[PDB]
Design an enzyme around this catalytic site. Structure first.
Site, PDB file in Angstrom:
ATOM      1  CE1 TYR A 124      -6.866  12.167  -6.887  1.00  0.00           C
ATOM      2  CE2 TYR A 124      -9.039  12.701  -5.886  1.00  0.00           C
ATOM      3  CZ  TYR A 124      -8.257  12.317  -6.984  1.00  0.00           C
ATOM      4  OH  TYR A 124      -8.878  12.128  -8.182  1.00  0.00           O
ATOM      5  CE1 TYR A 172     -10.784  11.028  -2.411  1.00  0.00           C
ATOM      6  CE2 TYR A 172     -10.964  13.292  -1.561  1.00  0.00           C
ATOM      7  CZ  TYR A 172     -10.349  12.043  -1.557  1.00  0.00           C
ATOM      8  OH  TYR A 172      -9.310  11.815  -0.717  1.00  0.00           O
TER       9      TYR A 172
HETATM   10  N1  LIG Z   1      -7.341  10.109  -4.484  1.00  0.00           N
HETATM   11  C1  LIG Z   1      -6.233   9.804  -3.784  1.00  0.00           C
HETATM   12  O1  LIG Z   1      -5.106   9.756  -4.272  1.00  0.00           O
HETATM   13  C2  LIG Z   1      -6.422   9.527  -2.237  1.00  0.00           C
HETATM   14  C3  LIG Z   1      -7.728   9.612  -1.688  1.00  0.00           C
HETATM   15  C4  LIG Z   1      -7.752   9.451  -0.304  1.00  0.00           C
HETATM   16  C5  LIG Z   1      -6.720   9.184   0.538  1.00  0.00           C
HETATM   17  N2  LIG Z   1      -5.461   9.061  -0.069  1.00  0.00           N
HETATM   18  C6  LIG Z   1      -4.292   8.667   0.844  1.00  0.00           C
HETATM   19  O2  LIG Z   1      -4.036   7.293   0.763  1.00  0.00           O
HETATM   20  C7  LIG Z   1      -3.599   6.770   2.049  1.00  0.00           C
HETATM   21  C8  LIG Z   1      -4.528   5.706   2.498  1.00  0.00           C
HETATM   22  O3  LIG Z   1      -4.022   4.457   2.099  1.00  0.00           O
HETATM   23  P1  LIG Z   1      -4.709   3.775   0.855  1.00  0.00           P
HETATM   24  O4  LIG Z   1      -5.711   4.656   0.210  1.00  0.00           O
HETATM   25  O5  LIG Z   1      -3.725   3.278  -0.119  1.00  0.00           O
HETATM   26  O6  LIG Z   1      -5.477   2.532   1.597  1.00  0.00           O
HETATM   27  P2  LIG Z   1      -6.316   2.492   2.901  1.00  0.00           P
HETATM   28  O7  LIG Z   1      -7.770   2.661   2.660  1.00  0.00           O
HETATM   29  O8  LIG Z   1      -6.038   1.292   3.725  1.00  0.00           O
HETATM   30  O9  LIG Z   1      -5.745   3.796   3.629  1.00  0.00           O
HETATM   31  C9  LIG Z   1      -6.334   4.229   4.862  1.00  0.00           C
HETATM   32  C10 LIG Z   1      -5.495   3.742   6.012  1.00  0.00           C
HETATM   33  O10 LIG Z   1      -5.902   4.449   7.208  1.00  0.00           O
HETATM   34  C11 LIG Z   1      -6.221   3.542   8.210  1.00  0.00           C
HETATM   35  N3  LIG Z   1      -7.266   4.075   9.051  1.00  0.00           N
HETATM   36  C12 LIG Z   1      -8.560   4.370   8.763  1.00  0.00           C
HETATM   37  N4  LIG Z   1      -9.191   4.931   9.800  1.00  0.00           N
HETATM   38  C13 LIG Z   1      -8.238   4.963  10.813  1.00  0.00           C
HETATM   39  C14 LIG Z   1      -8.268   5.419  12.160  1.00  0.00           C
HETATM   40  N5  LIG Z   1      -9.328   5.973  12.744  1.00  0.00           N
HETATM   41  N6  LIG Z   1      -7.131   5.269  12.889  1.00  0.00           N
HETATM   42  C15 LIG Z   1      -6.037   4.704  12.298  1.00  0.00           C
HETATM   43  N7  LIG Z   1      -5.904   4.264  11.079  1.00  0.00           N
HETATM   44  C16 LIG Z   1      -7.053   4.419  10.373  1.00  0.00           C
HETATM   45  C17 LIG Z   1      -6.614   2.277   7.484  1.00  0.00           C
HETATM   46  O11 LIG Z   1      -6.533   1.133   8.349  1.00  0.00           O
HETATM   47  C18 LIG Z   1      -5.607   2.251   6.336  1.00  0.00           C
HETATM   48  O12 LIG Z   1      -4.310   1.709   6.665  1.00  0.00           O
HETATM   49  C19 LIG Z   1      -3.560   7.883   2.982  1.00  0.00           C
HETATM   50  O13 LIG Z   1      -2.282   8.539   3.102  1.00  0.00           O
HETATM   51  C20 LIG Z   1      -4.574   8.787   2.340  1.00  0.00           C
HETATM   52  O14 LIG Z   1      -4.263   9.901   2.926  1.00  0.00           O
HETATM   53  C21 LIG Z   1      -5.295   9.340  -1.478  1.00  0.00           C
END
Ligand SMILES: NC(=O)c1ccc[n+]([C@@H]2O[C@H](COP(=O)([O-])OP(=O)(O)OC[C@H]3O[C@@H](n4cnc5c(N)ncnc54)[C@H](O)[C@@H]3O)[C@@H](O)[C@H]2O)c1
Ligand SMILES: NC(=O)c1ccc[n+]([C@@H]2O[C@H](COP(=O)([O-])OP(=O)(O)OC[C@H]3O[C@@H](n4cnc5c(N)ncnc54)[C@H](O)[C@@H]3O)[C@@H](O)[C@H]2O)c1
Ligand SMILES: NC(=O)c1ccc[n+]([C@@H]2O[C@H](COP(=O)([O-])OP(=O)(O)OC[C@H]3O[C@@H](n4cnc5c(N)ncnc54)[C@H](O)[C@@H]3O)[C@@H](O)[C@H]2O)c1
Ligand SMILES: NC(=O)c1ccc[n+]([C@@H]2O[C@H](COP(=O)([O-])OP(=O)(O)OC[C@H]3O[C@@H](n4cnc5c(N)ncnc54)[C@H](O)[C@@H]3O)[C@@H](O)[C@H]2O)c1
Lengths: 297, 297, 297, 297
Positions: free
Chosen positions: C177, C187
């Site tokens: 991001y 953020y």
């Molecule tokens: N601004 C943005 O565009 C933004 C911000 C942050 C993250 N992201 C990305 O989005 C994705 C996250 O999915 P989302 O945001 O759609 O929903 P989400 O919140 O579910 O994504 C987080 C995922 O990581 C898992 N998780 C959290 N802690 C964990 C741990 N210790 N071990 C294993 N799994 C763990 C959660 O269960 C979940 O499936 C990631 O690839 C993240 O990197 C994008």
């Protein structure tokens, strides 16, 4: 720890009055002790030299020590023309250009050489674009090239023609704007294009001139210059206001601030800095959103 | 999960033979199902159409399914000229340009309109710089502007003239090179300058055309095309070798690889991608040192 | 011109439901023909597997061909723990972690190896930051490190442990991001810090793994996922709205769009792309001002 | 045009001897007239204070005016520990840490407050990474986090704890390295990761602290410090040689050069500069190829 330019001589291209970045850089350099030579667009020459003589810029000439900046010599210049054989009957015949001489890049440089023998610092502060108010989609080839010619290639030309008379360990500095790297609506006519070329050329020339003559080459990506309008209308005034509201530090930008950065950059203190784009814009460039967007209140 | 361009029509500017990026993109688009229109520089027209007729490019026409790419129509074009009144007696009189017609940007676009009514994809793959072998310090204004004119402004012109006949949700793609952002000695004559303008214009036009007609605009920053020479001598061959030795992944670059990236980028799958510079260069651009520098063994 | 992943196997880390980027990537890969293995955070395991069994995600499982995506196997995982000896009595004793096993990175990877022998694609889609709502100035060391540990180092760990079982010519992809490169207020908690590390690591690992095993490593810098809220309140909803108003192309971002980019990037078509940050954000990143700033009307 | 810091007070974190960037910055600031406070790692304290007392750094203390730099006060510090309750029996019991007190960030800052009441400038010049010689693929979680903790978060902590006692219009400066943005093999152990976080945090903190207290926040991306080794062996010596051969300007980098840039950046002359990454590396960063690659002769 002074920024010490005593004994150094600067040629500043692009001064027509006391209101732009050019004047601001000249003032800083002058404060630092440099001897000041000015290249003035030759349609502006007259009114510039006249005002200067009448004392019209006297308040603007005030340096930090209370003394008045001295301009050692004003040279007419039109930086879209390299040598005399490039000038059209067309232009040569106009009253203004008719009144003066040695205003091509090749000619001015030869004059400086004759007059002073050498320079240490080159400042480029000129830009010009006939269709700046048009979107790219509406810009003509001729308008686009004109902007490139006066705003980008003019730096290549100046550097190239002056290089032989620049003392090694000297430096040059130009002024740029973010529109080169990011989308700024309203900065039209290929001016964004031209700033992108100027920045890229800065890096290339840092290599060419650094290896060739030990000359440093940098550019300053400045923000909008001045304080807020009572009613912002027009590109500049609007960006002034935008920046004030949205920069990491809430303040306006003064000429001072740009001139001091330049002075540092062309000085020996900056000996390890070259091919660089230095942001002198209150950190606007780093922001990822506008704080004043209505979504945020 | 196909990259599906069936029913879409592409206009590819800059194809003179089967050896460049242009041909490579046409092949990918053709594999994806697009209908192919080609814009050929008019000094190259004859030999191109002849070779094609003689079957000289037949091996190069082979698609993944074993079928042969079909070029629906070849249009002569000279992208430094916008309309007929911009052409010099000079050029109009030469044998080559004399032989054909409707080759200005305005004319080709009107022909496509007449012929097909619309297009969905615009590919720019032409560049040209008379002084490309000279350092900037030695490049003339005329040489510098020529490079900008044929390599940067030609994209603005094409887009602008074709936009009215592009279906919304369509896209354009151009080809760029790292020399815009980093110092690449040997990429002279203002070609680095021109690539910097093209990249900056990509972003600006993504805004202008995106808002205006829902058209996506991107560019691919490609590496040197082809396999290693037995004895690398000359700019390209030398960069091929450099890249092979120094990229994060040790391999050469094939036309395929660039063409497939393009196909993806102009497809509906890439609907959230616009104003982007996509590196298709085996990751060279990310490297901070040359692995083969003698300091490192 | 298919994006063809038949015969390839993917391990997707970070799927807990059908609402994030993870699910979106799995769907695209599945459409392309890949066999899907899922790594689910072990506090989420139960409800995920249950919903799946009850048919609760059936509408979300619909692929373009009308068929339903199949998840070949769900593996519990907690990516902040590398091996069993790193787990605290503390955590080992909690009900949730108590219920399952082999959830450390080292253990999951050994299980996949035992189960399938190899994989071709690695997807990282997990992030986590306890103090994400706090400004940096208010973030604790522990909170900052936790974010780095779960959001950056977890990718290093996964890659490192899986590499031995990845077939050469395979690839990995992570999600990033813009907050890493630009200031995005809100953020917090070191999540911006963590995205900066992840991006930098992407480049380094492209070199390390590219040279070591011919594996490509890239990241997608995605925008806010979903359509506009009736009343945007909260970080995400607010950014959705911001982006819609201010991107070069006015539209929302769908999971589709991110998943399709990923599918392309981990496919053989993208063979010349590595160490790259690909923006899948409707071109927001390129904008230099907010169009909706009140200064502009 | 002086860089005038008379009446200003600086706290410099990370000085253990007269050989690093820290000492170099202190010297410049001292030349400019600032009052100098030093934060010394507490395992280094003794030998540092002893050498200083014996006159061992006297040659290194020489300022441009021939006078000797004065260090107003040396404060022990260990920047991986925020407050006393974060210290392990483990560490508290070691001879070194046993010998001194108030060395946690919270404690040092309270001492400075008690001693002087305020500061104007904060310099961060400390970094540390236990596994710096390992590739990322071989770096442990613990090693990776340690590097982040001492090299990135330590800046957040310092700033945060000192902010309340910093006079508005003051500034901070940190030191970074290109490995954050480009691949530099040999800069291992998560140190590249840590520099990426530090840079990203610089921008975020420029916003947070700029708006909160009118404090400027920048970082200098410096090159390798010192002259060439007779036989370059080891990371640093090798990069020194690499840079000398391959930078746009052929020269080594001196501490001077970095210290002078810093002095300028924390001064009032730099009032429009914040959230910036300033390259003080002889322009290496701008180069797109290594001039000494054997492909080029
Ligand atoms: N601004 C943005 O565009 C933004 C911000 C942050 C993250 N992201 C990305 O989005 C994705 C996250 O999915 P989302 O945001 O759609 O929903 P989400 O919140 O579910 O994504 C987080 C995922 O990581 C898992 N998780 C959290 N802690 C964990 C741990 N210790 N071990 C294993 N799994 C763990 C959660 O269960 C979940 O499936 C990631 O690839 C993240 O990197 C994008
Ligand atoms: N957004 C921004 O921050 C922004 C935008 C554009 C240009 N600039 C920079 O600002 C400086 C321009 O000064 P300013 O904007 O304060 O005022 P200005 O408009 O007077 O600057 C342009 C200068 O160039 C001179 N000039 C124009 N055409 C010329 C020609 N053919 N030959 C010689 N001189 C010519 C003008 O006489 C004038 O002195 C330049 O360095 C320009 O590069 C910044
Ligand atoms: N270092 C690099 O990776 C690099 C360097 C330069 C250009 N490129 C890109 O490569 C592509 C060029 O194809 P190539 O290099 O494989 O071979 P090429 O030399 O044939 O490409 C140039 C093409 O432009 C055409 N052309 C030249 N002047 C023209 C004019 N005035 N009007 C119309 N057409 C004209 C030529 O006929 C030819 O088809 C372009 O997209 C160019 O942008 C990449
Ligand atoms: N490639 C590069 O240019 C590069 C690489 C790394 C770091 N740096 C920068 O160089 C500076 C380091 O100084 P140097 O490299 O000249 O010599 P150095 O190795 O002595 O610098 C590290 C300094 O940090 C101190 N330090 C280490 N761990 C500490 C802790 N836990 N608490 C407090 N102090 C601690 C050391 O005592 C020392 O003064 C820093 O600003 C660092 O950020 C540059």
């Amino acid at each position: 720890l002074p920024i010490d330019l005593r004994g150094k001589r600067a040629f500043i291209a692009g001064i027509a009055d006391d209101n732009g970045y050019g004047w601001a850089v000249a003032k800083s350099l002058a404060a630092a002790g440099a001897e000041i030579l000015v290249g003035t667009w030759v349609p502006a020459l007259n009114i510039f030299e006249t005002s200067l003589r009448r004392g019209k810029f006297d308040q603007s000439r005030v340096l930090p020590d209370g003394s008045l900046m001295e301009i050692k010599k004003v040279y007419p210049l039109d930086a879209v023309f390299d040598n005399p054989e490039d000038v059209p009957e067309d232009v040569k015949a106009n009253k203004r250009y008719a009144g003066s001489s040695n205003w091509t890049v090749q000619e001015a440089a030869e004059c400086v050489r004759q007059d002073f023998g050498s320079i240490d610092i080159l400042v480029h502060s000129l830009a010009n674009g006939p269709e700046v108010s048009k979107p790219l989609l509406e810009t003509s080839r001729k308008g686009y090239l004109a902007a490139i010619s006066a705003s980008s290639y003019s730096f290549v030309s100046l550097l190239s023609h002056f290089l032989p008379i620049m003392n090694p360990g000297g430096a040059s500095i130009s002024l740029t704007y973010i529109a080169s790297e990011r989308i700024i609506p309203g900065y039209g006519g290929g001016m964004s294009s031209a700033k992108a070329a100027l920045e890229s050329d800065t890096r290339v020339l840092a290599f060419e001139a650094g290896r060739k003559q030990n000359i440093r080459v940098n550019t300053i990506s400045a923000g909008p210059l001045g304080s807020r309008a009572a009613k912002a209308i027009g590109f500049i005034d609007t960006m002034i206001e935008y920046s004030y509201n949205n920069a990491p530090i809430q303040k306006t930008l003064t000429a001072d601030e740009v001139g001091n950065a330049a002075a540092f950059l062309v000085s020996p203190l900056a000996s390890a800095i070259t091919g660089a784009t230095i942001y002198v814009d209150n950190g606007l460039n780093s922001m990822g959103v506008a704080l004043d967007s209505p979504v945020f209140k």
